[PDB]
Design an enzyme around this catalytic site. Structure first.
Site, PDB file in Angstrom:
ATOM      1  N   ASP A 130      15.335  90.546  -2.382  1.00 44.04           N
ATOM      2  CA  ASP A 130      16.080  90.201  -3.586  1.00 44.04           C
ATOM      3  C   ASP A 130      15.204  89.609  -4.692  1.00 44.04           C
ATOM      4  OD1 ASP A 130      18.474  90.411  -4.877  1.00 44.04           O
ATOM      5  OD2 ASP A 130      19.268  88.488  -4.174  1.00 44.04           O
ATOM      6  N   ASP A 157      23.503  90.563   6.466  1.00 42.54           N
ATOM      7  CA  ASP A 157      24.612  91.416   6.852  1.00 42.54           C
ATOM      8  C   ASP A 157      25.944  90.830   6.418  1.00 42.54           C
ATOM      9  OD1 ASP A 157      25.680  93.746   8.404  1.00 42.54           O
ATOM     10  OD2 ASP A 157      26.638  92.140   9.547  1.00 42.54           O
TER      11      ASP A 157
HETATM   12  O1  3OR Z   1      20.573  82.086  -0.877  1.00 42.40           O
HETATM   13  C1  3OR Z   1      20.533  83.309  -0.709  1.00 42.40           C
HETATM   14  N1  3OR Z   1      20.962  84.209  -1.661  1.00 42.40           N
HETATM   15  O2  3OR Z   1      21.673  83.653  -2.765  1.00 42.40           O
HETATM   16  C2  3OR Z   1      23.019  84.160  -2.793  1.00 42.40           C
HETATM   17  C3  3OR Z   1      23.979  82.997  -2.596  1.00 42.40           C
HETATM   18  O3  3OR Z   1      23.977  82.190  -3.761  1.00 42.40           O
HETATM   19  C4  3OR Z   1      20.016  83.872   0.599  1.00 42.40           C
HETATM   20  C5  3OR Z   1      20.427  85.184   1.027  1.00 42.40           C
HETATM   21  C6  3OR Z   1      19.957  85.745   2.256  1.00 42.40           C
HETATM   22  C7  3OR Z   1      20.389  87.123   2.704  1.00 42.40           C
HETATM   23  N2  3OR Z   1      19.910  88.188   1.832  1.00 42.40           N
HETATM   24  O4  3OR Z   1      18.476  88.260   1.838  1.00 42.40           O
HETATM   25  C8  3OR Z   1      17.923  88.897   0.666  1.00 42.40           C
HETATM   26  C9  3OR Z   1      18.585  90.264   0.511  1.00 42.40           C
HETATM   27  C10 3OR Z   1      20.068  90.083   0.242  1.00 42.40           C
HETATM   28  C11 3OR Z   1      20.736  89.025   1.100  1.00 42.40           C
HETATM   29  O5  3OR Z   1      21.962  88.953   1.111  1.00 42.40           O
HETATM   30  C12 3OR Z   1      19.075  84.978   3.053  1.00 42.40           C
HETATM   31  F1  3OR Z   1      18.612  85.471   4.212  1.00 42.40           F
HETATM   32  C13 3OR Z   1      18.664  83.694   2.654  1.00 42.40           C
HETATM   33  F2  3OR Z   1      17.834  83.045   3.473  1.00 42.40           F
HETATM   34  C14 3OR Z   1      19.104  83.094   1.431  1.00 42.40           C
HETATM   35  N3  3OR Z   1      18.685  81.801   1.022  1.00 42.40           N
HETATM   36  C15 3OR Z   1      17.443  81.155   0.818  1.00 42.40           C
HETATM   37  C16 3OR Z   1      16.185  81.667   1.266  1.00 42.40           C
HETATM   38  C17 3OR Z   1      14.976  80.981   1.039  1.00 42.40           C
HETATM   39  C18 3OR Z   1      14.996  79.753   0.350  1.00 42.40           C
HETATM   40  I1  3OR Z   1      13.214  78.760   0.038  1.00 42.40           I
HETATM   41  C19 3OR Z   1      16.217  79.205  -0.117  1.00 42.40           C
HETATM   42  C20 3OR Z   1      17.422  79.916   0.124  1.00 42.40           C
HETATM   43  F3  3OR Z   1      18.577  79.393  -0.318  1.00 42.40           F
HETATM   44  N1  ANP Z   2      15.806  75.241  -5.969  1.00 42.70           N
HETATM   45  C1  ANP Z   2      16.454  75.308  -7.178  1.00 42.70           C
HETATM   46  N2  ANP Z   2      16.157  74.447  -8.174  1.00 42.70           N
HETATM   47  C2  ANP Z   2      16.783  74.498  -9.359  1.00 42.70           C
HETATM   48  N3  ANP Z   2      17.731  75.405  -9.605  1.00 42.70           N
HETATM   49  C3  ANP Z   2      18.090  76.308  -8.659  1.00 42.70           C
HETATM   50  C4  ANP Z   2      17.449  76.288  -7.396  1.00 42.70           C
HETATM   51  N4  ANP Z   2      17.983  77.274  -6.659  1.00 42.70           N
HETATM   52  C5  ANP Z   2      18.889  77.890  -7.351  1.00 42.70           C
HETATM   53  N5  ANP Z   2      18.996  77.333  -8.595  1.00 42.70           N
HETATM   54  C6  ANP Z   2      19.915  77.744  -9.667  1.00 42.70           C
HETATM   55  O1  ANP Z   2      21.270  77.884  -9.127  1.00 42.70           O
HETATM   56  C7  ANP Z   2      21.935  78.990  -9.808  1.00 42.70           C
HETATM   57  C8  ANP Z   2      22.542  79.977  -8.800  1.00 42.70           C
HETATM   58  O2  ANP Z   2      21.544  80.411  -7.880  1.00 42.70           O
HETATM   59  P1  ANP Z   2      22.177  81.569  -6.963  1.00 42.70           P
HETATM   60  O3  ANP Z   2      23.196  80.976  -6.094  1.00 42.70           O
HETATM   61  O4  ANP Z   2      21.039  82.206  -6.013  1.00 42.70           O
HETATM   62  O5  ANP Z   2      22.876  82.704  -7.898  1.00 42.70           O
HETATM   63  P2  ANP Z   2      21.838  83.829  -8.501  1.00 42.70           P
HETATM   64  O6  ANP Z   2      20.504  83.990  -7.607  1.00 42.70           O
HETATM   65  O7  ANP Z   2      21.444  83.395  -9.856  1.00 42.70           O
HETATM   66  N6  ANP Z   2      22.686  85.337  -8.584  1.00 42.70           N
HETATM   67  P3  ANP Z   2      23.231  85.904  -7.025  1.00 42.70           P
HETATM   68  O8  ANP Z   2      22.022  85.779  -5.950  1.00 42.70           O
HETATM   69  O9  ANP Z   2      23.641  87.323  -7.144  1.00 42.70           O
HETATM   70  O10 ANP Z   2      24.510  85.056  -6.511  1.00 42.70           O
HETATM   71  C9  ANP Z   2      20.878  79.660 -10.720  1.00 42.70           C
HETATM   72  O11 ANP Z   2      21.117  79.299 -12.087  1.00 42.70           O
HETATM   73  C10 ANP Z   2      19.547  79.118 -10.217  1.00 42.70           C
HETATM   74  O12 ANP Z   2      18.606  79.050 -11.276  1.00 42.70           O
END
Ligand code: 3OR
Ligand code: ANP
Ligand code: MG
Length: 280
Positions: A130, A157
């Site tokens: 992603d 998944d």
């Molecule tokens: O947080 C996530 N995605 O953001 C969507 C929810 O806001 C997130 C999503 C997945 C699963 N996935 O893998 C990519 C391909 C599409 C997909 O669905 C995953 F395995 C994760 F570990 C995630 N979090 C994450 C990882 C590393 C750090 I440092 C901090 C984190 F929060």
């Molecule tokens: N570690 C972090 N520090 C500061 N801001 C963060 C951090 N992680 C996420 N954000 C912010 O939180 C918001 C949402 O993150 P996220 O939940 O992953 O949605 P997204 O990646 O922008 N789109 P999507 O993955 O499709 O849901 C965004 O505006 C990010 O910039």
């Protein structure tokens, strides 16, 4: 690090996406300020604990190019992922304050994104899955880090990513049934760079709902940078990232030695200063 919901106290909301919401929180017992992502899934406890179990690997990620991890746990139907707070936000947020991002800043971002990907691939044999502007975070120290990568196979998944949201960074091969590989992250990165350079999501070239977009991507030719504003290096770089045939598309070894990267790597760019000023 041993976290639990009562340790925390909410400071503010950093933002939300399709699948979750992220909070800036205080972790009281340690004094740490962290970002807390909450994910809500309607899944059976078995797979949920499998997620938390798999997420535990983030502890072993340790790179200048990868966001910091503190711990993952579950409570109240929410999965918590607790991160290094990144005071500059995602590049997708910067993009809204700045309209578009300079190709010299973009060269720095690319070097970061390339190194981060290689680190995840060399050291953990996982692909990111992603890469997009919202998953590239920056801070006032001028750091550029990747997050939200696919560390947990169960979590991928469960989120059924592929059909949600309005933009897609999915590559052609994947949308035609190909196995996922690093090439697919290259495509994502180039599409990201184009978007950040021009200031809008490139597909289509200047309403489209997810399925049409996805069809458009596997059929029409790839997006390209406009004709006069960017150096011919930057656009050959982006072009080599967006070659529709994964066979032809560049790989990380090739990108790392491309003309654009060599230059960007030498250019003296004050990213932190450009940042605190574009958003302050
Ligand atoms: O947080 C996530 N995605 O953001 C969507 C929810 O806001 C997130 C999503 C997945 C699963 N996935 O893998 C990519 C391909 C599409 C997909 O669905 C995953 F395995 C994760 F570990 C995630 N979090 C994450 C990882 C590393 C750090 I440092 C901090 C984190 F929060
Ligand atoms: N570690 C972090 N520090 C500061 N801001 C963060 C951090 N992680 C996420 N954000 C912010 O939180 C918001 C949402 O993150 P996220 O939940 O992953 O949605 P997204 O990646 O922008 N789109 P999507 O993955 O499709 O849901 C965004 O505006 C990010 O910039
Ligand atoms: Mg994200």
């Amino acid at each position: 690090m041993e976290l639990k919901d009562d340790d925390f106290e909410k400071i503010s909301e950093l933002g939300a996406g399709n699948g979750g919401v992220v909070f800036k929180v205080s972790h009281k017992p340690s004094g740490l300020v962290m970002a807390r992502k909450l994910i809500h899934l309607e899944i059976k406890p078995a797979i949920r604990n499998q997620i938390i179990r798999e997420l535990q690997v983030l502890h072993e990620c340790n790179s200048p190019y990868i966001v910091g991890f503190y711990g993952a746990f579950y409570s109240d139907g929410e999965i918590s992922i607790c991160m290094e707070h990144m005071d500059g936000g995602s590049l997708d947020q910067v993009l809204k304050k700045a309209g578009r991002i300079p190709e010299q800043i973009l060269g720095k971002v690319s070097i970061a994104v390339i190194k981060g990907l290689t680190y995840l691939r060399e050291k953990h044999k996982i692909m990111h899955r992603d890469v997009k502007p919202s998953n590239i975070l920056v801070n006032s120290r001028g750091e550029i880090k990747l997050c939200d990568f696919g560390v947990s196979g169960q979590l991928i998944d469960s989120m059924a990513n592929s059909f949600v949201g309005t933009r897609s960074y999915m590559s052609p091969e994947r949308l035609q049934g190909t196995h996922y590989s690093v090439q697919s992250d290259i495509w994502s990165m180039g599409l990201s760079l184009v978007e950040m350079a021009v200031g809008r999501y490139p597909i289509p070239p200047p309403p489209m709902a997810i399925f049409e977009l996805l069809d458009y991507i596997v059929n029409e030719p790839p997006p390209k940078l406009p004709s006069g504003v960017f150096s011919l290096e930057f656009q050959d770089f982006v072009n080599k990232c967006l070659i529709k045939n994964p066979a032809e598309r560049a790989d990380l070894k090739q990108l790392m030695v491309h003309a654009f990267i060599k230059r960007s790597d030498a250019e003296e760019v004050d990213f932190a200063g450009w940042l605190c000023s574009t958003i302050g």
